[PDB]
Amino acid sequence: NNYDGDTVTFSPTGRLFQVEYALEAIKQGSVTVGLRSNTHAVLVALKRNADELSSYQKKIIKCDEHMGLSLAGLAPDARVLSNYLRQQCNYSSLVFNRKLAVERAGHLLCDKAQKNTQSYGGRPYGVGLLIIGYDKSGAHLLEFQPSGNVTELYGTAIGARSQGAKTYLERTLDTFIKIDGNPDELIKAGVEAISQSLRDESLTVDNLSIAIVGKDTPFTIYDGEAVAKYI
Amino acid sequence: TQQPIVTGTSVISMKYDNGVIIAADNLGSYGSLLRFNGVERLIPVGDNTVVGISGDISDMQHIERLLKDLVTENAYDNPLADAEEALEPSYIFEYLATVMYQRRSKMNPLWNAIIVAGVQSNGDQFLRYVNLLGVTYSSPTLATGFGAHMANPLLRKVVDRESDIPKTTVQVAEEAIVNAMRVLYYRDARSSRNFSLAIIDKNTGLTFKKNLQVENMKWDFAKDIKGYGTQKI
Amino acid sequence: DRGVSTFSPEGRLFQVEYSLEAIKLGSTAIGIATKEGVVLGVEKRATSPLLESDSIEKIVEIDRHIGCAMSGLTADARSMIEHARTAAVTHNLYYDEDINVESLTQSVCDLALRFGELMSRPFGVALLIAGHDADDGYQLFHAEPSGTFYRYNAKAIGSGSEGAQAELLNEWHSSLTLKEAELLVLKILKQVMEEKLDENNAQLSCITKQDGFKIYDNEKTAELIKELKEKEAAE
Amino acid sequence: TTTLAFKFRHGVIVAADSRATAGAYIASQTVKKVIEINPYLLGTMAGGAADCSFWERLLARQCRIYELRNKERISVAAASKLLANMVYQYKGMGLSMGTMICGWDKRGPGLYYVDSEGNRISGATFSVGSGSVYAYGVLDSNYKWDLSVEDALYLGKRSILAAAHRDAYSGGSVNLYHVTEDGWIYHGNHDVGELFWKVKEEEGSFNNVIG
Amino acid sequence: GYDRALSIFSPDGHIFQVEYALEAVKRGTCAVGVKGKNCVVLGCERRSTLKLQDTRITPSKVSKIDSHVVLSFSGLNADSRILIEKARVEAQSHRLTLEDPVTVEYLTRYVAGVQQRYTQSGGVRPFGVSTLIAGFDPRDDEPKLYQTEPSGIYSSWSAQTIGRNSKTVREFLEKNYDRKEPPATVEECVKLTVRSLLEVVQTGAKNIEITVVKPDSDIVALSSEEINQYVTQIEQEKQE
Amino acid sequence: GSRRYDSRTTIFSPEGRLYQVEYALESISHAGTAIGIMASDGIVLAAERKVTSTLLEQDTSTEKLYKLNDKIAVAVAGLTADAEILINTARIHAQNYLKTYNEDIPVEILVRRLSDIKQGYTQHGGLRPFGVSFIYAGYDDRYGYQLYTSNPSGNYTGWKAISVGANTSAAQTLLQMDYKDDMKVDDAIELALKTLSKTTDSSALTYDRLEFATIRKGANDGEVYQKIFKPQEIKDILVKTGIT
Amino acid sequence: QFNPYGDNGGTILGIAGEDFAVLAGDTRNITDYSINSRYEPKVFDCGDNIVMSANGFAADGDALVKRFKNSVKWYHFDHNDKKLSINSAARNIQHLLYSRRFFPYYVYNIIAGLDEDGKGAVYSFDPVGSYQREQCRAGGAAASLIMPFLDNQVNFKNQYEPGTNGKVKKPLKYLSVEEVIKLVRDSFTSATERHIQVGDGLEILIVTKDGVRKEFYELKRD
Amino acid sequence: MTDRYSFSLTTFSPSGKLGQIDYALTAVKQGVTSLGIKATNGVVIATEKKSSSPLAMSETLSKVSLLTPDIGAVYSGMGPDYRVLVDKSRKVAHTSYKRIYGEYPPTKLLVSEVAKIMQEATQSGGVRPFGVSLLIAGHDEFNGFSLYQVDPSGSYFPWKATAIGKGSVAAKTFLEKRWNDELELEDAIHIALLTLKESVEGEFNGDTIELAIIGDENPDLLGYTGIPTDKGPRFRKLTSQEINDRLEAL
Numbered sequence A: 001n002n003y004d005g006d007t008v009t010f011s012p013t014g015r016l017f018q019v020e021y022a023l024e025a026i027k028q029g030s031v032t033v034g035l036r037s038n039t040h041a042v043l044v045a046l047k048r049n050a051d052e053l054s055s056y057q058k059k060i061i062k063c064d065e066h067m068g069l070s071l072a073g074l075a076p077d078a079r080v081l082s083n084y085l086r087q088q089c090n091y092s093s094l095v096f097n098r099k100l101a102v103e104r105a106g107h108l109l110c111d112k113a114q115k116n117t118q119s120y121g122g123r124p125y126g127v128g129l130l131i132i133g134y135d136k137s138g139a140h141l142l143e144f145q146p147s148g149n150v151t152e153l154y155g156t157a158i159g160a161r162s163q164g165a166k167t168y169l170e171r172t173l174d175t176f177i178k179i180d181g182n183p184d185e186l187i188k189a190g191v192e193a194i195s196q197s198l199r200d201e202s203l204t205v206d207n208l209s210i211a212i213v214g215k216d217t218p219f220t221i222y223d224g225e226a227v228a229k230y231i
Numbered sequence B: 001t002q003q004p005i006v007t008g009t010s011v012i013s014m015k016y017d018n019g020v021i022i023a024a025d026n027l028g029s030y031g032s033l034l035r036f037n038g039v040e041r042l043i044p045v046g047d048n049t050v051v052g053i054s055g056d057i058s059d060m061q062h063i064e065r066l067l068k069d070l071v072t073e074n075a076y077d078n079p080l081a082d083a084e085e086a087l088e089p090s091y092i093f094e095y096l097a098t099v100m101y102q103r104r105s106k107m108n109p110l111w112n113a114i115i116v117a118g119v120q121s122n123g124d125q126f127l128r129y130v131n132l133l134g135v136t137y138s139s140p141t142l143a144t145g146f147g148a149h150m151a152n153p154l155l156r157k158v159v160d161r162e163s164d165i166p167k168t169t170v171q172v173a174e175e176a177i178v179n180a181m182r183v184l185y186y187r188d189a190r191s192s193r194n195f196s197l198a199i200i201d202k203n204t205g206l207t208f209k210k211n212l213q214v215e216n217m218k219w220d221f222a223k224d225i226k227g228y229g230t231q232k233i
Numbered sequence C: 001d002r003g004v005s006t007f008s009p010e011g012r013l014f015q016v017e018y019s020l021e022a023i024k025l026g027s028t029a030i031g032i033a034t035k036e037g038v039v040l041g042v043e044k045r046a047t048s049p050l051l052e053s054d055s056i057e058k059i060v061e062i063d064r065h066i067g068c069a070m071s072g073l074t075a076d077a078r079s080m081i082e083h084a085r086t087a088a089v090t091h092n093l094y095y096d097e098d099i100n101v102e103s104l105t106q107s108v109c110d111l112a113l114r115f116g117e118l119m120s121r122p123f124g125v126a127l128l129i130a131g132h133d134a135d136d137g138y139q140l141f142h143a144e145p146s147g148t149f150y151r152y153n154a155k156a157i158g159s160g161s162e163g164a165q166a167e168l169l170n171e172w173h174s175s176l177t178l179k180e181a182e183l184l185v186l187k188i189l190k191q192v193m194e195e196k197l198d199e200n201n202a203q204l205s206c207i208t209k210q211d212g213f214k215i216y217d218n219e220k221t222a223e224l225i226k227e228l229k230e231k232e233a234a235e
Numbered sequence D: 001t002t003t004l005a006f007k008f009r010h011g012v013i014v015a016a017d018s019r020a021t022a023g024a025y026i027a028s029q030t031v032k033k034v035i036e037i038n039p040y041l042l043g044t045m046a047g048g049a050a051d052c053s054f055w056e057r058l059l060a061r062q063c064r065i066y067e068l069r070n071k072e073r074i075s076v077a078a079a080s081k082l083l084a085n086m087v088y089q090y091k092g093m094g095l096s097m098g099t100m101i102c103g104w105d106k107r108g109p110g111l112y113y114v115d116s117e118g119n120r121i122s123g124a125t126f127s128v129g130s131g132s133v134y135a136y137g138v139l140d141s142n143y144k145w146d147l148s149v150e151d152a153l154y155l156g157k158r159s160i161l162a163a164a165h166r167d168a169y170s171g172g173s174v175n176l177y178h179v180t181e182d183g184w185i186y187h188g189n190h191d192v193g194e195l196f197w198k199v200k201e202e203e204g205s206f207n208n209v210i211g
Numbered sequence E: 001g002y003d004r005a006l007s008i009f010s011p012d013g014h015i016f017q018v019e020y021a022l023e024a025v026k027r028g029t030c031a032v033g034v035k036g037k038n039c040v041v042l043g044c045e046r047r048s049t050l051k052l053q054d055t056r057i058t059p060s061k062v063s064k065i066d067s068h069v070v071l072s073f074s075g076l077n078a079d080s081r082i083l084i085e086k087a088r089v090e091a092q093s094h095r096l097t098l099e100d101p102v103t104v105e106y107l108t109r110y111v112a113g114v115q116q117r118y119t120q121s122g123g124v125r126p127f128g129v130s131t132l133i134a135g136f137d138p139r140d141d142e143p144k145l146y147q148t149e150p151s152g153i154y155s156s157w158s159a160q161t162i163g164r165n166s167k168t169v170r171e172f173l174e175k176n177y178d179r180k181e182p183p184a185t186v187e188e189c190v191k192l193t194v195r196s197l198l199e200v201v202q203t204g205a206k207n208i209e210i211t212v213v214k215p216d217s218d219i220v221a222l223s224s225e226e227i228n229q230y231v232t233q234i235e236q237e238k239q240e
Numbered sequence F: 001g002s003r004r005y006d007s008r009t010t011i012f013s014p015e016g017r018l019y020q021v022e023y024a025l026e027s028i029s030h031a032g033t034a035i036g037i038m039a040s041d042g043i044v045l046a047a048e049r050k051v052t053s054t055l056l057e058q059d060t061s062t063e064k065l066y067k068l069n070d071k072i073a074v075a076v077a078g079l080t081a082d083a084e085i086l087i088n089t090a091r092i093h094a095q096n097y098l099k100t101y102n103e104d105i106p107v108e109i110l111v112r113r114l115s116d117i118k119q120g121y122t123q124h125g126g127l128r129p130f131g132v133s134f135i136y137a138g139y140d141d142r143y144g145y146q147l148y149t150s151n152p153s154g155n156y157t158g159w160k161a162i163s164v165g166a167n168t169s170a171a172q173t174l175l176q177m178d179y180k181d182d183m184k185v186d187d188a189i190e191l192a193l194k195t196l197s198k199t200t201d202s203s204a205l206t207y208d209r210l211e212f213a214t215i216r217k218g219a220n221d222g223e224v225y226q227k228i229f230k231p232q233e234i235k236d237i238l239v240k241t242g243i244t
Numbered sequence G: 001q002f003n004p005y006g007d008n009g010g011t012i013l014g015i016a017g018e019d020f021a022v023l024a025g026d027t028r029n030i031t032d033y034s035i036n037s038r039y040e041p042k043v044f045d046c047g048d049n050i051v052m053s054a055n056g057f058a059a060d061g062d063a064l065v066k067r068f069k070n071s072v073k074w075y076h077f078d079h080n081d082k083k084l085s086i087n088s089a090a091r092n093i094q095h096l097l098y099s100r101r102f103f104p105y106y107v108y109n110i111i112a113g114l115d116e117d118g119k120g121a122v123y124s125f126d127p128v129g130s131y132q133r134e135q136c137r138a139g140g141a142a143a144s145l146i147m148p149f150l151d152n153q154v155n156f157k158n159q160y161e162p163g164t165n166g167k168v169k170k171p172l173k174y175l176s177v178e179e180v181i182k183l184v185r186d187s188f189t190s191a192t193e194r195h196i197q198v199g200d201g202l203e204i205l206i207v208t209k210d211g212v213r214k215e216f217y218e219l220k221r222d
Numbered sequence H: 001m002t003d004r005y006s007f008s009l010t011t012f013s014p015s016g017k018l019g020q021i022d023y024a025l026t027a028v029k030q031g032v033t034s035l036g037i038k039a040t041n042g043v044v045i046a047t048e049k050k051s052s053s054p055l056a057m058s059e060t061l062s063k064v065s066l067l068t069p070d071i072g073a074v075y076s077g078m079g080p081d082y083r084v085l086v087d088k089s090r091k092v093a094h095t096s097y098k099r100i101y102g103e104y105p106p107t108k109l110l111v112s113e114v115a116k117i118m119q120e121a122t123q124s125g126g127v128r129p130f131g132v133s134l135l136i137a138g139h140d141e142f143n144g145f146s147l148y149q150v151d152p153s154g155s156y157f158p159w160k161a162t163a164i165g166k167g168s169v170a171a172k173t174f175l176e177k178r179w180n181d182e183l184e185l186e187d188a189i190h191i192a193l194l195t196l197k198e199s200v201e202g203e204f205n206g207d208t209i210e211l212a213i214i215g216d217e218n219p220d221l222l223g224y225t226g227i228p229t230d231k232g233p234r235f236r237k238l239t240s241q242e243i244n245d246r247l248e249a250l
């Protein structure tokens, strides 16, 4: 109300409204799902178009051979944060000959987003990210909020109508975690999860976007006729 | 640009079937003056790596602190710091190699020759060299300074190529290293009798031996040597 | 007052949304992508008859294989064009090749959100970036001040955009020829323009693989207008 | 190197050898010492190979932006000047460049000499490189304005040959260019080994050499 | 440094500071530009509220940017000096780096770019100035006349006016100026420029300034008597 | 943050005016009247000190008339402290020009430089403008005797006769009436004092309430002399012209 | 005084075929008269069917290769996983080298792969960025020993057809991969004999449309 | 962090008033009375030592301050603002003059430098004006004795005699009747004590009054002998006893 003019101002109940408004931009964004087993980690994203003449906005970005994310909200902010991750993953390789741990990648994103919430002039990031990766401690899935909060999860979903997919994964928890050494079945569970967030529209060939990473699988993105198999 | 003041001489090392051995004497020379007699030049990093350093001792102590700080920094927000996400020999080396080359590129080098010896997660032997120029190389045997000229020839008789590594036991490898250290004591004017030796085995882990001495030395034949040519008495 | 980089309660940047209102007031620009090329056309909209219309430059070359049309506060586009041209030529310097249309568009859109308290406000202009490369062929992009860019088969921006876009919805198909696309831009421009369309108050352009980016002469466009009138009177 | 260029009624001829040297060792014998700035502009390379190549390609990018901004092809005078000012920043720093900016613009055919020392000179006839001194003799004695394109191409070719023969650091092959108002035209690569014997027989020159 | 964003968008998509800068131009004295077949004439209003003025030393309204280009303006006088200085520096910088004088179109593009830069830079307000830039390109006999404004947009004009009551004189020019046959001579061009100012000026005494620019750097400013002869002839023909 | 407290000194009003410049001019209108009159053989500068006291040390006082160099002087109207900042800058500029070209700075060039500084404070920096209006009286070999004025907007104009500060409307009317082109310095001196005497808010115009100066070619042969009048000399010229 | 440069010896060789390309180099690393390693790889697979070797000062060579590999990585990120052509890589490498014009990478660099028409390509660089495409090029310590041999046996220089007596040249018949590898091995075996910095081992990287293959051969260890 | 107040905090209001300067002058009005009187052979400056507590040692708080050996200062308004101005005034006398010309600045030029500092606090970013009016008395070879007032705006005026602060209006009227151009220094001190008694409520003695003079050179206060041209400081602060002696002949 009077305390939402900038990010540097707490409200009387201890709330940061500019951060909450940035969180609102994620809810307006298109749905995206993340889930993992012990061997693989999968991202599934519903891409959005402007109209029938337009293309479908890309949702998934590769960060390294073993790591990447999907976005929901302001796409340019995802480009900035993914570029930062690319550099950090790259610094770890060049200097330490070491693949960046997914947990440490989350810690770096948290700290980068936080600086934008405590300083005057700047603004919070207006995007939510789902980071997947495979490192020395196996498969990983992270959820990033622009408040700075990063959370390691078995599965999750963000964006519009994401509560439906999140409930499904909460029921399926015991099943999909056990899908080891079977990438196609893990993707099937992801495609079935994101389907719980759909209304009116359905998953078409240029609508769906999938990405996977695992034990002997580099981070690869599937679009177009490559995802027709899963429709 | 500087000049080295207090210096450490040869560091020698070699691979064997299950790991690596590395050794270095305990002397800190001040030119021709054998100034400091209790200097440790092998510095362990965790339980899987030993960094052996020759050259300027003040720069060695600086590097020692960087490595100590590296361990501290790796533990930060790292539940697997003593397991999967522990520091590897390859990580430690590449870090040093990055620092050494950056420093030479600012014309302000760390006046050292470094050998990183260790065993990786998968049990593979790691042995690589880096120096003040940022020059890096790996070999079954590695040695710095005088060791390169005198120790390598002896150690290469044991492990001449990659295929000789599985055929070489820890007893044979240690014997060769200890013999090389004796030869260096005979012939290197900036060496000492006292030295330290470290073995990093993939089964038995890190064994760090201090206060070793060169023994079984041959000097008796000196009594028969008289003059420099014609003198008989 | 209030921050320039402030979010609204709905999760939108106030300034970006306000710049979009400025673009709605701008003159119409239309782009149509085909397999034979991409056509770009604009409404010149001279404020007075004494204004020499040929000096109105709302269609612009970025490289031999990339063209650009603008709508909104056209003065803001000059630094964007300058950056685009520099990016295109710089990439040719570093890589001895033409730059991808998408990569060029991405480079332009990276400037968009570099505002705060960097420049003091977002750009008040939208761009239609059309071009061709070997990888993805003939392409048409719509670059906004939000930093977002969508690829389009056909797109209209400016004051008559929603009316023109609905018309492009019905008219576009994947087998359009270049000549058909030229007439289609002229048709829709004539429909949404206030004044009567002629060769002096409207301008056409295209980008083909062979000849590259070309702005059409007023004599060439005049013939296409006369060809349009006759084919509409034909039924 | 030996490079030359000269203006004449029908444009400007540009010729150069192809030898690259690293002391007494011949590193290469197939080097392009002529640079394609734009379809109406050429640049020669003499001295530092890397320096000449880098700055002239940088010049070329500068010239292209010019065309985009101004809707007009850059002049030879302005192009040579951009180079001159660019290298002048790094004067005394170790750059080694001897170049000629050849082209046709609104003022007709243009030819500028530009070096790392800071000189920028307009002229009808130039030759730069270790073998320039040998080439000048043939040029000065046979150069006219009323020269046919056929005769002009031969003069520039024969002048390089003269230098390639005597200068140890010049040779390999001859590259020829002709710049018209409709743009530059490449007139081929000519091996000096074969060209020498041909010229000797047909012209009668190089009598002292046995063949 | 002072970084405050003064020029910003409003809910209806307007940058008020740029629009209020146009109001400063509306307040400024009238300026007019007319190009003939082989010349361009720049006319300027001088408000007669200020008498006891020293006309020798008072800053003239038309400024030479180079020997072949001139610039007149309407709006804040102090602001115009900054643009003119920058334009003059750029003109010499262009001669120095490219060995050719600026084209009229290039100079206009530079000045317009400066004006635009001040609409999206922190800590600065827009120039309260619109300019008329006229001249002839080097080795060219085609007349050039451009206009700029605070937003940074620019365009070429057969004839144009800016400043106070510019709406009226533009109305006059739109019906009197024929594109198919522009003022063939200098006399006809000056006469039309004076006529247009007489619709607004008040008295035709020291209130009208005229500057004729011809090809090949031939620029001259008319005197009071020379202009007064035009004022006399116009009104004598009008009495009919 | 800090934005909350920013007055925004460099913005346009809806009518296209600069708020702070207009308000600075309002300040200057309450300042003591300063008059400049240019004649064929010299220039006069006259100015009124504001409600003085008997205990003010007048002979060592200077609030209105300042010397920029040997050829150029200024009369001030507004904040004295602000004026001194600008005066010292102008003095430096005149010396820079002299060092560079080995010639005394032309009057207009000095005036333009100061006026450009004032302009800068209206367009950028976020600072308040200088609440000062100058009358420049000077001589050079190009244009001879010159009178200029500058105000907080940074706009400057040339004059034959001009007033700044309080009651300029009334003062300008009186000057416009009695001024003629063939006028001389001695006549201009009389006009300046008569104009102040009629426009003053004080009961009577006395020597202790005035600062006065002339720039004359009335120096031995082809050269120019600046005369800053002393209290006793102002008293004498008041008697001579028949005011006291 | 500190000398930031060194000489790690070694020699490299790139030959371009009709539909393939090879990049060979010995595996010996040295300082002065000592051997550091008998097997220290010097030729690398940089991605996009490009192989690279920076010979001379190993620390600068390793840094350049490391940077180029990184340049390839970012070329994919920034341009939609587009394949970096050999001609584009060469131009990129020029700019990596000239970015240190006043503190050069003390290396002679060679890259090999396939052009956009599928034909074999070899590019040669000087330490400061001057590059050119070639059919045959040896770089490094024993470059002067090998190049004249390649001029003779690859481009058939000073070779004429018998009977004509210098009137008709030997025709430029293309070489197969098996014929090329023979010239490579004989080049290095001959260089090993007369150059002290050459020996120990020879590692060859062959590039075809199918990918990048390796071959290793021992050399004299004296 | 960073100082983000790069804009003026003092601005013109519609009426032409500079609010913060006016308000600073109001703070000066509330301040304790101080005065200055110029004689033929000297200058005197005086003020009341308004002690905040009787436990406080008022000797440690110096309202009258030496700026140079021949220049002194007193104030009315905010004490802390005065203290820092004195520190800056002392320093600027060296940096902008003594280190250049090898001698101390004349009164008018030091005043000019102080005035400049106060003007800049009236226009620079993120600062308020100084809340003090200064009275600066001094002597130099070519200008003789002088007395200057400096206001928050940066404006300064030379005075024969004046007063600032609480009871300045009444005090200036008192000084107008008593002042003439033939006053000796002792006469000026006497008038200063009479004028100051009217504005003081409580105790009026050497311990509650602070008074200094610019007069004859004091070789006894120089601290060294041997250089004829160095004759000592003209600034002298009167002692508690010296004031009380003149209060008996009051």
Ligand SMILES: *[C@@](C)(CO)[C@](*)(O)[C@H](Cc1ccccc1)NC(=O)[C@H](Cc1ccc(OC)cc1)NC(=O)[C@@H](C)NC(=O)CN1CCOCC1
Residues within 6 Å of the ligand: D001, D002, D019, D020, D021, D022, D023, D027, D028, D031, D032, D033, D045, D046, D047, D048, D049, D050, D052, D096, D129, D130, D169, D170, G124, G125, G126, G130, G131, G132
């Ligand atoms: C003649 C041959 C020498 O006087 C002529 O100036 C050539 C000009 C030239 C122009 C473009 C490309 C190649 C050559 N110059 C050279 O051959 C120079 C001479 C030179 C040697 C040493 C220098 O350092 C002070 C400066 C100039 N040679 C080089 O530049 C040499 C160092 N580089 C190359 O030969 C580059 N090649 C070598 C093979 O790998 C590909 C690049």
Ligand SMILES: [Mg+2]
Residues within 6 Å of the ligand: G191, G192, G193, G194, G195, G196, G197, G198, G199, G220, G222
């Ligand atoms: Mg050998």
